[PDB]
Design a binder for this molecule. Structure first.
Ligand SMILES: Nc1ncnc2c1ncn2[C@@H]1O[C@H](COP(=O)(O)OP(=O)(O)OP(=O)(O)O)[C@@H](O)[C@H]1O
Ligand SMILES: [Mg+2]
Lengths: 578, 471, 51, 153
């Protein structure tokens, strides 16, 4: 291999000399401790290496060895129910070696080399195999893990191991030209995995939150962005999506965030149960953790590792949801590396190629026909942390040119404990019109009309609230105070949702449809009764107003009867009304 | 020549650049082939050549390149594109290679992709009125054949649907102009820079539904494609369009999906080379580079064909003073600006008429072209809408109960204008229907307040009620 | 009512906008100063290639 | 300059697990300690309260206090423009709650308190509003603690 020595150390950047022959974006092992680094600039006899670990204590003259391969991940059985480093190192195996602190120079295998898997073959000698085909199946925590041919491999099958129990690194299928296929293969994290075709998304991604599933839907192969200031509700939203969504597999990427949140996920999730099958919720989750005090250069690698894992699980036919805890920390890492490289920045110190990297990351989502003929999907929800809440910063503006849904958070709503604190005036979704045939046949035939009616009521209330705040609500007519009160009822009974309640944390589509029906029926009856001269104060004191306000705390089992009782009560109360 | 000369001796690879020392025989602006150690071949262009070393910008990514086995060989002296009449109905990538699985193009010619400036003596004035079928465009911001009329959009606004509708509904009106020539359909040249899968799928489905794929040439550069390839896509598209129009008498319509991505790639190359920036880090020569693209449209005296340009650009905020829209407005011949406030009220197409402009409107409207009252009606509509918009602020300040009768008339006019003239949906309106609706709206004002309209046209056309058409 | 509305709403918003605009302009000035410093450094470093 | 969007407090708020913000307006009217509840936050609140730790009514009481104080502050902002005669009785009750909050709950000297005394004080103020406005708190907890007056004379 190419082998040189350190010439200059400055921060996370090491310049090696004697490296004539190293290629761009290869992996190098720096120093005697074998720190992992990547080549990002070649200059004559030298090479510029960015190290993914801490560079303190290094001395000039230490060896630098190039492995000749780009950064990669090991894809195979044994990846669910685990938590990984930024560069795919299992943390729970690091703990057994180095105690309670993360030290550098630790080398572990990503997949366990000692566990046995029950192998069941699906090919026979004399078959022709291409990339993405299924060699066999292996059981997991209620899943059926398919062993796939690597995408660049082609040949004829010579022999197949019989059904039994083997480890990952044993060749199960030998091809005719000599290639031996194991239970795992490696893939470069900067290359998107191939597919046959890309399809149009036509089914919803059910998040379990009323406002995100009704007003601003997202499809099953779409992308969404959720920006907002600190303490406004990004992490709680993404963890609720992890708990309650209908995805088969969830990949959570905590790039540059607190270490306590990953501990909370690690502790709480084994006790819960997934909505799909039963059994613990952790059996469908993959965790990639890179906290804020961990090395900065590994923030970039964790995102690519997570998206490659999500793409691998897509190729088996599953539906995968991917959450990035903050993509602003990735931009900060890029800025730091470019500052070390002495490049000219574009805006706010960011390198000019930030938007290209962001567009290449988000473009990996979508519903596809896989090379094996099955159908998978990847949906990406990325969180943005703009400085000071300023929504004109480059990272926020670059994200809005590629995402299909824009869920905007507001600090004003979060101050008054109005959660999820989604600004329903500045948010939008481009998937609403494409999901209507699904809604008309899976929820109700008049659901879009009800949703549009609620949006119209919100718009009219927002229009009136400009007049109200300067003249006073007493001067308004009854037909306007009715709209104000109905808007408040919608705002506090429908949009508001508590993520820590035992019942309100999850909401089905039919429960939301029933609540919308109750609110619209009450509004219709009140509008009819206003014309007979009834005061607003008589309507506001009706006992049925409490029934609508308590409707969201009713469990999913008792709701279909509570709904009928409330409808009959509304009709009776407005028929017996003065 | 037929020999190939290889230049080993690369001394620097970083980002999109590459240095080679003994390459003094490489001409400025040449196209090269960069061969990997494993045989993969990538393209590049010389941007600075000296007797010391030459500088090359690489189109694809630089993964896998090394300083020992990489070699650079000259492909051609000048960047040229092999064009033909048989590229109609084909699809290409951002550098002219086919991606539809069909055999390559046998070139009738090879033309330079930077093009040459048109002689102003050889040009002629655009005169033919184009009926887009949208009232806010046909009546107040008229588009004529041979114009550059970009669309100024935003993040969540439907610019692509408006462009598809314009391409679907566009026609000339020989009966009104008296030319009498039977109209041929527009040929479409479509160039996409950093387009997403959602937008590309929408455009492909629309073109399949309208049956226009037999007349279309497509250059596709997707969002996961290399960034530096975007420098070449609009030049190739405009080269093909100019060839078709000024050699085979086609009437070509050109759509450019996002000029923001082109400017981003330009900024990347400029910042790599340490150029003197303009505002917000964009290079100081962006005006010249953008003008070399927009100024290739028009009509040439002595020839039947024409080139019409409809660029689409998303403003990086709702900011008209950003460098990209500012320079585009300085170069082009007007703009169509979309409004987010109109979009939130459920109005489609959400075209804001006040910041919009068409510079060539006076050439194609009037007596003998559309109708003799077009210009005065447009001016009166503009003045009345501006008055209503200004009265809205007074209402917001002092309350709508202290108004007089005239102010309430203007307020009602503005509301009815937004609800009836702008909002039309997916329907295709003729020019006469749009003028009828416009005269219906103007009849809600007193006859003495129509200052900008001549008294003869007022006597001829005033008085019709809005409920005779929409009631 | 008008006096209180002006004093409690209109003036603080204008003041906040002024503060924001001034900070943005100052940031742009600082970035341009950094660019000029780099350019002067490159000019100085070019003048001693071969002595 | 009391700016929450300055880089130092903005970057601090992205790392820590909450913040306590002091108020200059509460300082001007002599209240000690001048802690503003609306921009204050504690993210690890829910881990250490509830059943088996302190009392079972802690979280709902905190939510109701936040909602009622927010409504009172909104009404107080409205009064300063229009004037204190167009208010209905419900909004007057919210204003009364808002002014009682600042001088009873927030204000204290060096008076060390217990959690249960403070919960009693919190339930005292929540009894200034009808049971129809206690929308967060469940029906069971209302029948257990509602309806007590200020025992501090
Ligand atoms: N849906 C919700 N239901 C109830 N409480 C919520 C909800 N969302 C947020 N909160 C409350 O608001 C707090 C906001 O903290 P959170 O971790 O969500 O912030 P964030 O937006 O991720 O911030 P950061 O920028 O620091 O990462 C939570 O700790 C919780 O107390
Ligand atoms: Mg968070």
């Amino acid at each position: 291999m190419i082998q040189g020595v350190i010439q200059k150390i400055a921060g996370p950047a090491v310049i090696a000399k004697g490296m004539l022959g190293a290629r761009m974006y290869d992996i190098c092992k720096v120093g005697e401790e074998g720190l992992v680094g990547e080549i990002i600039r070649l200059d004559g006899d030298t090479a510029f290496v960015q190290v993914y670990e801490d560079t303190s204590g290094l001395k000039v003259g230490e060896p630098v060895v190039s492995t000749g391969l780009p950064l990669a991940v090991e894809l195979g059985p044994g990846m669910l129910n685990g938590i990984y480093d930024g560069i795919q190192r299992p943390l729970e195996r690091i703990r057994e070696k180095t105690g309670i602190y993360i030290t550098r120079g630790v080398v572990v295998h990503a997949l366990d080399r000692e566990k046995k898997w029950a192998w069941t073959p699906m090919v026979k000698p004399g078959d022709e195999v291409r990339g993405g085909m299924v060699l066999g199946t292996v059981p997991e925590f209620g899943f059926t893990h398919k062993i796939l041919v690597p995408p660049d491999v082609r040949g004829r099958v010579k022999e197949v191991k019989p059904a039994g129990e083997y480890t990952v690194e044993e060749p199960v299928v030998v091809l005719e030209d000599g290639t031996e296929l194991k239970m795992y293969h490696t893939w470069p994290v900067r290359r998107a995995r191939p597919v046959q075709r890309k399809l149009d998304p036509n089914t919803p991604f059910l998040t379990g939150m009323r406002i995100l599933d009704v007003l601003f839907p997202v499809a099953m192969g779409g992308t969404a962005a959720i920006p907002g200031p600190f303490g406004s509700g990004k992490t709680v939203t993404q963890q609720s999506l992890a708990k309650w969504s209908n995805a088969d597999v969830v990949v959570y990427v905590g790039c540059g965030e607190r270490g306590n949140e990953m501990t909370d996920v690690l502790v709480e999730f084994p006790e819960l149960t997934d909505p799909k099958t039963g059994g613990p919720l952790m059996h469908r989750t993959v965790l990639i953790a890179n906290t804020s005090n961990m090395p900065v250069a590994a923030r970039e690698a964790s995102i690519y590792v997570g998206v490659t894992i999500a793409e691998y699980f897509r190729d088996q036919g599953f539906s995968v949801a991917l959450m990035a805890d903050s993509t602003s920390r990735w931009a900060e890492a890029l800025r730091e590396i470019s500052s070390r490289l002495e490049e000219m920045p574009a805006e706010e110190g960011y390198p000019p190629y930030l938007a290209a990297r962001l567009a290449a990351f988000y473009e990996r989502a979508g519903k596809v026909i896989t090379l094996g003929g099955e159908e998978g999907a990847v949906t990406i929800v990325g969180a943005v942390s703009p400085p000071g809440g300023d929504m004109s910063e480059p990272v926020t503006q670059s994200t809005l040119r590629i995402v299909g849904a824009f869920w905007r958070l507001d600090a004003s709503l979060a101050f008054r404990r109005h959660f999820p604190a989604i600004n329903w005036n500045g948010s939008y979704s481009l998937f609403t019109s494409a999901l209507d045939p699904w809604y008309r046949e899976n929820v109700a035939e008049d659901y879009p009309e009800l949703r549009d009616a609620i949006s119209e009521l919100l718009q009219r209330e927002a229009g009136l609230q400009e007049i109200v705040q300067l003249v006073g609500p007493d001067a308004l007519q009854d037909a306007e105070r009715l709209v104000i009160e109905v808007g408040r009822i919608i705002r506090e009974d429908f949009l508001q949702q508590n993520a820590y309640h035992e019942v309100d944390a999850y909401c089905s589509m039919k429960k939301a449809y029933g609540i919308m029906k109750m609110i619209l029926a009450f509004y219709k009856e009140a509008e009819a009764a206003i014309k007979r001269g009834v005061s607003i104060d008589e309507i506001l004191q009706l006992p049925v107003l409490e029934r609508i306000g308590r409707a969201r705390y009713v469990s999913e089992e008792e709701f279909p009867a509570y709904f009928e009782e409330a409808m009959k009560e509304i009709q009776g109360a407005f028929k017996a009304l003065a | 020549d037929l020999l190939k000369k290889e230049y080993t001796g690369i001394t620097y690879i970083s980002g999109p650049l590459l240095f080679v020392e003994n390459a003094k025989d490489l001409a400025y602006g040449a196209i090269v082939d960069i061969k990997d150690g494993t045989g993969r071949v990538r393209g590049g262009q010389v941007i600075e050549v000296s007797e010391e070393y030459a500088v090359i910008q690489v189109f694809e990514e630089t993964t896998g390149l090394d300083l020992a086995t990489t070699s650079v060989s000259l492909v051609e002296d000048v960047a040229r594109l092999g064009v033909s009449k048989e590229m109609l109905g084909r699809r290409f990538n951002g550098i002219g290679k086919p991606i539809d699985g069909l055999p390559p193009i046998t070139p009738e010619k090879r033309l330079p992709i930077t093009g040459l400036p048109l002689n102003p003596v050889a040009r002629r004035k655009p005169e033919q009125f184009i009926q887009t079928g949208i009232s806010t465009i046909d009546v107040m911001n008229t588009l004529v054949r041979g114009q550059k009329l970009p669309i100024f959009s935003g993040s969540g606004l439907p610019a692509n649907e408006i462009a598809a509708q314009i391409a679907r509904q566009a026609t000339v009106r020989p009966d009104l102009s008296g030319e009498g020539e039977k109209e041929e359909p527009f040929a479409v040249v479509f160039a996409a820079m950093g387009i997403t899968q959602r937008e590309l799928s929408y455009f492909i489905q629309e073109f399949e539904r309208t049956g226009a794929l037999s007349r279309s040439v497509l250059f596709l550069n997707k969002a996961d494609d290399p960034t530096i390839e975007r420098i070449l896509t609009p030049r190739m598209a405009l080269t093909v369009a100019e060839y078709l129009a000024f050699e085979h008498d086609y009437h070509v319509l050109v759509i450019l999906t996002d000029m923001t991505n082109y400017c981003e790639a330009l900024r990347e190359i400029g910042a790599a080379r340490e150029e003197i920036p303009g505002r917000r880090g964009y290079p100081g020569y962006m005006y010249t580079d953008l003008a070399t693209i927009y100024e290739r449209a028009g009509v040439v005296e002595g020839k039947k064909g024409s080139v019409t340009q409809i660029p689409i650009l998303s403003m990086p905020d709702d900011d008209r003073t950003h460098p990209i829209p500012d320079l585009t407005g300085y170069i082009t011949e007007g703009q169509i600006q979309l409004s987010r406030e109109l979009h939130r009220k459920g109005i489609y197409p959400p075209i804001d008429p006040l910041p919009s402009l068409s510079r060539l409107m006076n050439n194609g409207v009037g007596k003998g072209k559309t109708r003799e009252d077009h210009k005065q009606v447009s001016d009166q509509l503009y003045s009345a809408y501006a008055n209503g918009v200004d009265i809205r602020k007074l209402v917001a300040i002092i309350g709508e109960d202290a108004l007089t009768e005239n102010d309430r008339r203007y307020l009602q006019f503005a509301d009815a204008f937004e609800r009836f003239f702008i909002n039309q949906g997916q329907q295709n309106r003729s020019i006469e229907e749009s003028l009828q609706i416009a005269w219906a709206l103007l009849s809600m004002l007193p006859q003495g307040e129509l200052k900008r309209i001549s008294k003869d046209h007022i006597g001829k056309y005033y008085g019709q009620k809005l409920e005779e058409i929409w009631g | 009512r008008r006096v209180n509305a002006l004093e409690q709403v209109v003036i603080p918003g204008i003041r906040a906008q002024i503060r924001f605009i001034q900070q943005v302009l100052e940031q742009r000035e600082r970035e341009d100063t950094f660019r000029l410093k780099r350019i002067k450094g490159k000019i100085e470093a070019r003048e001693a290639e071969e002595e």
